[PDB]
Design a protein around this ligand. Structure first.
Ligand SMILES: Cc1cc2nc3c(=O)[nH]c(=O)nc-3n(C[C@H](O)[C@H](O)[C@H](O)COP(=O)(O)OP(=O)(O)OC[C@H]3O[C@@H](n4cnc5c(N)ncnc54)[C@H](O)[C@@H]3O)c2cc1C
Length: 368
């Protein structure tokens, strides 16, 4: 009646994909999102092979490239201007390729599919107000800020790095530790060199610049420098100090990409955390994506891991909701499958970010 299978807090890329996968299975899903639907959150751009498998299982892979997603299989990494590593991800495995696809492009696609799933109801500009638990400490009722009351079998935090579900429903507090270098991303015209190949540049002074195409006709430039330097560089908004700083460690192959940086004003900061929560669930409440882990954005994997979590959670929840197994066993299974994968990328990110300056150490991180 007001009984539903799953109440998903947050309709980000993780939450959307979980809602679609559950809705495809005929589960009764309510998604609560505080923002308006059209609010575009720019975000990560990368899908790695495991994420691509989810997209492919959702029936979405063709539409990803039709909407500007790009299949790639190479990366060059430079340190102090010289090539350190070249990676061909498909040299052994034809499916080793990755995809560049803006988070918001993929989320809009998924939302279009949800629009046709009659068992899913998406509520925008809506928030959870209060919950009630039963004698077994499972949430049994949820009231929303519009006055709507629901009775869900399962509550999911897909609500991102400041997860309400984590903080308020599970009462978990997370220590922060900021990094000393921020990371910022800007969008520019696309140079032939960027269209050709992804190139990452780092230097012994702690500079980083990563150039890669996005969409049909744009390029990203992701940069990082120590905080005060980064501030000075972004202050000069016609961009001359940044172009010059890039020229110190970015060689001729990417000269046109550097010339494409006409200004600094549309650079955006990127969140940087370090987390992998030792529990992904309690009672009938589970979490995914940035609610449970924060990887250094140097890895590129924030969206990708949210999508991998979503798929594993949809599998585990489908089992529970079908009565193939007890919810606690299904949630325990979700955690065992995801935790080691998320942990490895969280460790890898931190190892990469802290080893920039040291050419040998940085190459060693790539290899291991
Ligand atoms: C500009 C930008 C650049 C980025 N670049 C990178 C990068 O280069 N590499 C990288 O690895 N990662 C990057 N990230 C991080 C990456 O986008 C995220 O890791 C990814 O989106 C996580 O997906 P998620 O579904 O878990 O959460 P999110 O995509 O954060 O989605 C959470 C959703 O929950 C909603 N929400 C939050 N609180 C509530 C509430 N109380 N009630 C209801 N709804 C709520 C939010 O509005 C949002 O829609 C970037 C992020 C930003 C914003």
């Amino acid at each position: 009646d007001n009984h539903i299978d799953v109440l998903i807090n947050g309709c980000g890329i993780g939450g959307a994909m979980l809602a679609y996968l559950l809705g495809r299975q005929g589960h009764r899903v309510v998604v609560v999102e505080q923002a308006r639907r059209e609010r575009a959150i720019n975000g990560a751009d990368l899908l790695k092979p495991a994420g691509i498998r989810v997209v492919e299982a959702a029936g979405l892979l063709a539409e990803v490239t039709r909407r500007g997603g790009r299949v790639r299989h190479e990366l060059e990494v430079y340190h102090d201007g010289e090539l350190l590593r070249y990676f061909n991800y498909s040299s052994v495995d034809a499916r080793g390729y990755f995809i560049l696809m803006p988070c918001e492009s993929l989320r809009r696609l998924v939302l279009e599919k949800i629009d046709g799933e009659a068992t899913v109801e998406m509520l925008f500009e809506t928030r959870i107000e209060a919950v009630q638990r039963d004698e077994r400490h499972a949430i049994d009722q949820v009231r929303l800020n519009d006055g709507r009351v629901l009775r869900p079998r399962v509550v999911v935090g897909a609500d991102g790095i400041a997860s309400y579900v984590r903080r308020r429903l599970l009462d978990i507090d997370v220590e922060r530790r900021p990094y000393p270098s921020p990371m910022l991303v800007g969008t520019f015209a696309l140079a032939p060199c960027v269209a050709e190949r992804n190139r990452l540049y780092v230097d012994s002074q702690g500079g980083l610049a990563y150039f890669y195409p996005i969409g049909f006709d744009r390029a990203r430039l992701v940069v990082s420098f120590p905080r005060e330097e980064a501030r000075e560089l972004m202050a000069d908004t016609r961009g001359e100090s940044l172009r010059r700083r890039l020229q110190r460690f970015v060689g001729d192959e990417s000269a046109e990409a550097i010339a494409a940086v006409t200004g600094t004003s549309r650079f955006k900061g990127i969140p940087i955390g370090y987390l992998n929560l030792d529990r992904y669930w309690a009672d009938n409440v589970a979490m995914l994506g940035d609610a449970i882990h924060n990887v250094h954005p140097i890895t590129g994997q924030g969206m990708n891991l949210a999508i991998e979590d979503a798929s594993a959670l949809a599998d585990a929840l489908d089992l529970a909701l079908r009565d193939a197994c007890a919810l606690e066993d299904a949630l325990a299974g979700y955690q065992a499958e995801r935790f080691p994968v998320n942990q490895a990328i969280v460790s890898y990110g931190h190892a990469l970010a802290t080893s920039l300056e040291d050419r040998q150490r940085f190459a060693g991180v790539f290899d291991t």
